[PDB]
Amino acid sequence: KPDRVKQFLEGFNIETFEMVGTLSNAQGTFALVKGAGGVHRVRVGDYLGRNDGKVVGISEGKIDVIEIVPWLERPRSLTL
Amino acid sequence: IKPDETRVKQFLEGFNIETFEMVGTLSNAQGTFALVKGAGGVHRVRVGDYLGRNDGKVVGISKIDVIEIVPWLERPRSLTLK
Amino acid sequence: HMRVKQFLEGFNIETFEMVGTLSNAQGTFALVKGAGGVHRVRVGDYLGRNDGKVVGISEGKIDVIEIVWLERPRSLTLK
Amino acid sequence: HMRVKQFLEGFNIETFEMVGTLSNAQGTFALVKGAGGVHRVRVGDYLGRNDGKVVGISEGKIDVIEIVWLERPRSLTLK
Amino acid sequence: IKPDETRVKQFLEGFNIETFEMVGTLSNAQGTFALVKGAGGVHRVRVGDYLGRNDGKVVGISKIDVIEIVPWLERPRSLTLK
Amino acid sequence: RVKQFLEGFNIETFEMVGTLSNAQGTFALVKGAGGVHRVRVGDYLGRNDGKVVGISEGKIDVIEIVLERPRSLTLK
Amino acid sequence: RVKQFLEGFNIETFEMVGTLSNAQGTFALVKGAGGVHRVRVGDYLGRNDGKVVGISEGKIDVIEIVLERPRSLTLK
Amino acid sequence: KPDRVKQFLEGFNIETFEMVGTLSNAQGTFALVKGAGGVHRVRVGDYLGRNDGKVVGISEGKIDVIEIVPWLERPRSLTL
Numbered sequence A, H: 001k002p003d004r005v006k007q008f009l010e011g012f013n014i015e016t017f018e019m020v021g022t023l024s025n026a027q028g029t030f031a032l033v034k035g036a037g038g039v040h041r042v043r044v045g046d047y048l049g050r051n052d053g054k055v056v057g058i059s060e061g062k063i064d065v066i067e068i069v070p071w072l073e074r075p076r077s078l079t080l
Numbered sequence B, E: 001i002k003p004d005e006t007r008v009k010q011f012l013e014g015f016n017i018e019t020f021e022m023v024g025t026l027s028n029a030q031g032t033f034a035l036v037k038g039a040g041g042v043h044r045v046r047v048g049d050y051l052g053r054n055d056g057k058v059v060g061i062s063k064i065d066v067i068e069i070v071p072w073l074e075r076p077r078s079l080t081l082k
Numbered sequence C, D: 001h002m003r004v005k006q007f008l009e010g011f012n013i014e015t016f017e018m019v020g021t022l023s024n025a026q027g028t029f030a031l032v033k034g035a036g037g038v039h040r041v042r043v044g045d046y047l048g049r050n051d052g053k054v055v056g057i058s059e060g061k062i063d064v065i066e067i068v069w070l071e072r073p074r075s076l077t078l079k
Numbered sequence F, G: 001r002v003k004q005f006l007e008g009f010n011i012e013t014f015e016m017v018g019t020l021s022n023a024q025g026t027f028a029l030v031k032g033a034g035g036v037h038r039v040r041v042g043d044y045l046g047r048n049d050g051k052v053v054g055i056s057e058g059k060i061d062v063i064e065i066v067l068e069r070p071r072s073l074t075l076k
């Protein structure tokens, strides 16, 4: 079931985004996602796109997302 | 209530407020700023600054609270940190 | 007025903010937030895609004269 | 309290300024001007050569507890 | 005239004023700052800030003009751009 | 060997502040020399020929020559 | 060839802002990729294998491969 | 004859300074001089040290200075 305050990158089409790298720093790991006119530092547990796309993993140049669609889980990836 | 037609509009008034994200707050010796990611950069925005195309005046940073003027009435909006 | 075009001529002037002025032992510069950084711009430098020559920096304002041939003054002002 | 010493432990704490605070989606950091840059310092980080542990950031002040063994609280305050 | 013994001294009060250089001025949306090279960095110093070990209060930026308190009397000093 | 810009600083002035991996490779983010720079395995840091030999788990391993001498820069 | 960090940006996002010569060599100062970086002859800029072949008189000469194609970045 | 408002690096012994490089930018050429606890961008026509040491040239990793001493001109250099 889709649920919460939606994040910024939920207001745009996920197909327009691009994974451009992984950055880790003292606070943990982020995927660098180009979309909506900028590069965002996206964490595991953040959301991308219009279908409740939850970021569940960042590894090996790939973001793993689980969307919720008519409800079914539908994985998606964004890769370098 | 009505738009001030002789104030000189600020840079972030030239873009749709829906393309902006609140990414944090910075406080230094001069006071407190909201960090707004928009128009291809990150801007330091103060209370009393403006965001978006509807005279959205920043009235609080604590979340950014904005009051727009729309066809006139006052219409509050906010931008919240993830 | 209308040379090798300067860096900030490769972007739309409407994407730039005058954010301040800096003066140092070498002179006075306007600080222009544009093309993903802040640039130190002098009188005689150029901004935007229409030959926008900087002709004055003063009182938190940069005065620029574009050519669109007709010259057209505009400014960028500090909030 | 008295691990791999952090970068700002290799300099005299008396050379650092609290210059501000920044909060973002990850938490709150004090901005410490020291060792030729500005660092984003969290509670639990260390400053100076005497095990100065940051124990609080609040109201423009960083609270630090050094060990010199006797513990000695001090602070760094924003102007 | 006498030193204020309960104000919290500023960082640049922990160094000799003779080791500082005025390297420029910066003005932004918040106002005007003198850029002071000292104590291993460059600092943004405002009117009403302090420099040096003698309660040197910055009273003007335009050259930085400072008024120190010394054994009390007021003693003006300046730091000038090259 | 052609010298690198970050060899003109004492290695003690550098902090490892993270890692960036992208289509160009894996870089350590080293804070020093006026900003934050991106350093690869086989690049150098410091004044004693400090070659970067590993970037992994928030640590940069460096081997200097003075005798080979291992050094590291660890993410806080 | 091992790729360089500044190959992950469009070359048009870079400005030549000066030159630094010191004990490590002669570097062009290129403003882009989040700050100002120091680039030597034989380093690369941009997404088309833009090799830096000269740094002189406030100009950086670059040769891209797409056919060799000369580009330059000139100090204002 | 020694003459003007003295510059900052005139209040320190020139023998303590070090030439650490040459930087040119849109405004011209500077020598980077480490002294008095910092690195200064010094121009031709600036002064170094306590004996009216005028910088007369910056070239080839070398700063050429002409001091005035008991009066005689006395050249000095600072080199990488």
Ligand SMILES: [Zn+2]
Pocket (backbone or CB within 6 Å): A008, A009, A040, A041, B021
């Ligand atoms: Zn975001």
Ligand SMILES: [Zn+2]
Pocket (backbone or CB within 6 Å): B001, B074
């Ligand atoms: Zn009202």
Ligand SMILES: [Zn+2]
Pocket (backbone or CB within 6 Å): B011, B012, B043, B044, C017
């Ligand atoms: Zn702005």
Ligand SMILES: [Zn+2]
Pocket (backbone or CB within 6 Å): C007, C008, C039, C040, G015
């Ligand atoms: Zn520029």
Ligand SMILES: [Zn+2]
Pocket (backbone or CB within 6 Å): D007, D008, D039, D040, F015
């Ligand atoms: Zn740090």
Ligand SMILES: [Zn+2]
Pocket (backbone or CB within 6 Å): E001, E074
């Ligand atoms: Zn008085």
Ligand SMILES: [Zn+2]
Pocket (backbone or CB within 6 Å): D017, E011, E012, E043, E044
């Ligand atoms: Zn300060």
Ligand SMILES: [Zn+2]
Pocket (backbone or CB within 6 Å): F068
């Ligand atoms: Zn070996």
Ligand SMILES: [Zn+2]
Pocket (backbone or CB within 6 Å): F036, F037, F038, G036, G037, G038
């Ligand atoms: Zn760099």
Ligand SMILES: [Zn+2]
Pocket (backbone or CB within 6 Å): G068
């Ligand atoms: Zn060829």
Ligand SMILES: [Zn+2]
Pocket (backbone or CB within 6 Å): E021, H008, H009, H040, H041
């Ligand atoms: Zn100086």
